[PDB]
Amino acid sequence: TSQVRQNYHQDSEKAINRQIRLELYASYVYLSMSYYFDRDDVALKNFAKYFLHQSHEEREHAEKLMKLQNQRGGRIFLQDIQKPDKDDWESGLRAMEKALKLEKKVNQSLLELHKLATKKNDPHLCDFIETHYLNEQVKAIKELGDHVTNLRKMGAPRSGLAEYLFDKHTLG
Amino acid sequence: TSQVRQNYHQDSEKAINRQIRLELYASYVYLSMSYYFDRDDVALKNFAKYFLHQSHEEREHAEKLMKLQNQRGGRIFLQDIQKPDKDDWESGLRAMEKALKLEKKVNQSLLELHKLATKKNDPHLCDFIETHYLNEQVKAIKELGDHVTNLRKMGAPRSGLAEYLFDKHTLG
Amino acid sequence: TSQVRQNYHQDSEKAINRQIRLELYASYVYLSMSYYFDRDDVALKNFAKYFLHQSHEEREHAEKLMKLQNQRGGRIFLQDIQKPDKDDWESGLRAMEKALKLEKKVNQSLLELHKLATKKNDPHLCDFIETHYLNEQVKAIKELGDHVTNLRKMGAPRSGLAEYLFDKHTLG
Amino acid sequence: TSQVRQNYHQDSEKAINRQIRLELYASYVYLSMSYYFDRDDVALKNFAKYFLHQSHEEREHAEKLMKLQNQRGGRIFLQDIQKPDKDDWESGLRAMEKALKLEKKVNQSLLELHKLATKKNDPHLCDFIETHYLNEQVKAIKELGDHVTNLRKMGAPRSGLAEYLFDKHTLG
Ligand SMILES: [Fe+3]
Ligand SMILES: [Fe+3]
Ligand SMILES: [Fe+3]
Ligand SMILES: [Fe+3]
Ligand SMILES: [Mg+2]
Numbered sequence: 028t029s030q031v032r033q034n035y036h037q038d039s040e041k042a043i044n045r046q047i048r049l050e051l052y053a054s055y056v057y058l059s060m061s062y063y064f065d066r067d068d069v070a071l072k073n074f075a076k077y078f079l080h081q082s083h084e085e086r087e088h089a090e091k092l093m094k095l096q097n098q099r100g101g102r103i104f105l106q107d108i109q110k111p112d113k114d115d116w117e118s119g120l121r122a123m124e125k126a127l128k129l130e131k132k133v134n135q136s137l138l139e140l141h142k143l144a145t146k147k148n149d150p151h152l153c154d155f156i157e158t159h160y161l162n163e164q165v166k167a168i169k170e171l172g173d174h175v176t177n178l179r180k181m182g183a184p185r186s187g188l189a190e191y192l193f194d195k196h197t198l199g
Numbered sequence: 200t201s202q203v204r205q206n207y208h209q210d211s212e213k214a215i216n217r218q219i220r221l222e223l224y225a226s227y228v229y230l231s232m233s234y235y236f237d238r239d240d241v242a243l244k245n246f247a248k249y250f251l252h253q254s255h256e257e258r259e260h261a262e263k264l265m266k267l268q269n270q271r272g273g274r275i276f277l278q279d280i281q282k283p284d285k286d287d288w289e290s291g292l293r294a295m296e297k298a299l300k301l302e303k304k305v306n307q308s309l310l311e312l313h314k315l316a317t318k319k320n321d322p323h324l325c326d327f328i329e330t331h332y333l334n335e336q337v338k339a340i341k342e343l344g345d346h347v348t349n350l351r352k353m354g355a356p357r358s359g360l361a362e363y364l365f366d367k368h369t370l371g
Numbered sequence: 372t373s374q375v376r377q378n379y380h381q382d383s384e385k386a387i388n389r390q391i392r393l394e395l396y397a398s399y400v401y402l403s404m405s406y407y408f409d410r411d412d413v414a415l416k417n418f419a420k421y422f423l424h425q426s427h428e429e430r431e432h433a434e435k436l437m438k439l440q441n442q443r444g445g446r447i448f449l450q451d452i453q454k455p456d457k458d459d460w461e462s463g464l465r466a467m468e469k470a471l472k473l474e475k476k477v478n479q480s481l482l483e484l485h486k487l488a489t490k491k492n493d494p495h496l497c498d499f500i501e502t503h504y505l506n507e508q509v510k511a512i513k514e515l516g517d518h519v520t521n522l523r524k525m526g527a528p529r530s531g532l533a534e535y536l537f538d539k540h541t542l543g
Numbered sequence: 544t545s546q547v548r549q550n551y552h553q554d555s556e557k558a559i560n561r562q563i564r565l566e567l568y569a570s571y572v573y574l575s576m577s578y579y580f581d582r583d584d585v586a587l588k589n590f591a592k593y594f595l596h597q598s599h600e601e602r603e604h605a606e607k608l609m610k611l612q613n614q615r616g617g618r619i620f621l622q623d624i625q626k627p628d629k630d631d632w633e634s635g636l637r638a639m640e641k642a643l644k645l646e647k648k649v650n651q652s653l654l655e656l657h658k659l660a661t662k663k664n665d666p667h668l669c670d671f672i673e674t675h676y677l678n679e680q681v682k683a684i685k686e687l688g689d690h691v692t693n694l695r696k697m698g699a700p701r702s703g704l705a706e707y708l709f710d711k712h713t714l715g
């Protein structure tokens with residue numbers, strides 16, 4: 028038992044390792060999406076930039092959980108990072124729809140993590156998830172929703188103008 | 200009788216309280232319009248910003264009439280602020296048409312107030328209405344007409360591309 | 372159901388609309404109080420400025436709840452803003468006592484909103500209320516308590532001198 | 544008849560000369576009031592400064608009407624400036640009550656000047672009075688009302704303390 032450990036349940040410690048893994052997976056998904064938009068046959072530079080910014084933010088989410096595990100005296104166990112569901116993300120609209128689903132999946136995991144921290148009477152952990160994660164997810168979800176709404180109303184993925192102009196005026 | 204009151208008719212005083220009520224109501228309509236465009240399924244940020252700015256402007260209009268009431272030694276009496284006629288404003292084009300209608304309604308009420316101030320030989324009040332309100336209405340109605348014309352020529356409300364581009368290039 | 376909605380109970384959505392209406396009502400009460408102190412027969416400019424500031428803050432409170440409703444994929448439903456209880460607020464001390472009572476009423480509403488968010492296991496909503504509302508209420512109640520205590524000790528409302536000097540020295 | 548004269552009634556020309564004389568008289572009353580507060584047995588320096596400022600403003604009012612007379616091709620006829628009604632202004636509160644009454648008397652004169660300009664279909668003259676005089680009078684009456692109300696509530700003229708503290712805190 029770590030000299031620093033206090034009011035930190037073993038279930039919490041394991042759940043934090045699972046969340047770390049999911050943050051690294053989200054990072055990998057956004058990295059894949061980014062370089063899809065960098066292809067000569069896709070060529071939407073601001074989509075590529077938007078998703079690469081998202082990838083680097085997911086790495087920071089992972090690192091802060093690894094910091095928290097060590098702050099509380101838990102022990103980091105890293106696992107294989109699963110390749111994303113797709114190599115070819117098909118269009119700007121479909122990548123955004125996939126990004127929205129991923130952020131709701133990360134959010135559901137953080138809500139399941141807060142539920143566990145609540146059951147284990149770990150208010151430090153509850154505060155950590157609320158301060159650093161829950162509102163980040165609600166903002167990322169609302170923004171991706173906003174982007175999907177716009178791309179659909181502009182007439183994507185059909186009208187080829189829509190994704191070009193959304194790339195320039197919203198993501199650029 | 201207020202020690203400041205001079206050449207200020209009872210009817211003028213009563214009409215100023217009702218104008219205060221109409222300005223607060225216009226603030227509320229514009230607040231409703233703003234947050235409609237903030238919805239994830241509408242997501243036109245510059246429409247939202249535009250209508251929130253009108254909302255704070257209507258607030259200032261109400262406050263300056265409340266200042267005038269006291270300057271002339273009238274007494275402010277407030278009523279319920281009615282909720283806007285719509286919860287859903289349907290489109291950018293439809294919200295601009297409703298704003299055009301609201302601004303003409305507020306202008307008509309100010310022209311009635313000026314007619315009453317004239318009938319009661321109150322040139323201070325006539326000057327107040329002309330200096331601070333009448334040209335502000337004409338400018339607002341012209342701007343909203345210009346917006347409605349461009350949204351119609353661009354092919355709104357059908358073309359969601361039209362509202363997206365108007366949002367960026369006119370209201371941005 | 373909105374594409375962004377996740378872990379957001381219908382009861383919490385309805386409770387956020389009721390809180391939006393109570394924030395707009397508190398804005399209206401403070402606007403009424405402000406322009407009472409602007410009357411030529413009351414003439415306390417710093418009481419007037421103090422309540423106008425509180426009025427503008429209550430609107431910001433309203434607006435942040437309207438943003439949250441859309442962030443969580445709820446739907447804003449605005450209602451009639453009821454007129455304030457009084458036209459004539461009697462004195463600086465009585466206006467401050469009524470403001471204290473209003474802030475405790477808004478606080479009670481927020482504490483019941485937090486109880487519902489807790490019962491519905493909505494930690495994002497709990498965090499929102501804690502971060503943006505609960506300590507604002509505690510500070511507003513404490514400050515109004517401080518003001519009522521000073522106005523009472525100075526001999527209000529049996530000294531027009533007390534309200535005059537408090538206006539200059541505390542609210543100035 | 545002057546080469547510049549156009550749409551300028553003989554009655555309006557005579558009324559502008561009468562207003563010039565009343566503005567010079569108001570300047571003289573405020574000069575008298577100012578140097579009352581400068582006496583060693585009254586000694587309220589900010590009452591003294593306040594009324595000297597009002598004296599200098601009334602002269603500017605006089606001068607702008609003299610410019611207008613020449614602008615419209617009227618002929619200035621100056622008369623004897625009557626001494627003020629009082630040598631001894633009794634107190635800060637009585638001087639302020641007399642100043643309020645003077646400003647309402649000057650306002651009544653201006654409103655009768657506007658009635659004549661309206662009856663003679665002189666919109667230039669109507670605009671001049673509205674733009675430069677009517678709101679100045681409304682503000683001066685409101686400010687004097689505010690001051691009388693504060694001096695009364697503070698316990699003037701049964702407190703030399705009230706007039707002392709008002710001099711420091713409002714007129715300082
Ligand atoms: Fe993340
Ligand atoms: Fe308005
Ligand atoms: Fe509030
Ligand atoms: Fe004058
Ligand atoms: Mg908690």
Ligand SMILES: [Mg+2]
Binds near residue numbers: 157158501
């Ligand atoms: Mg917390």
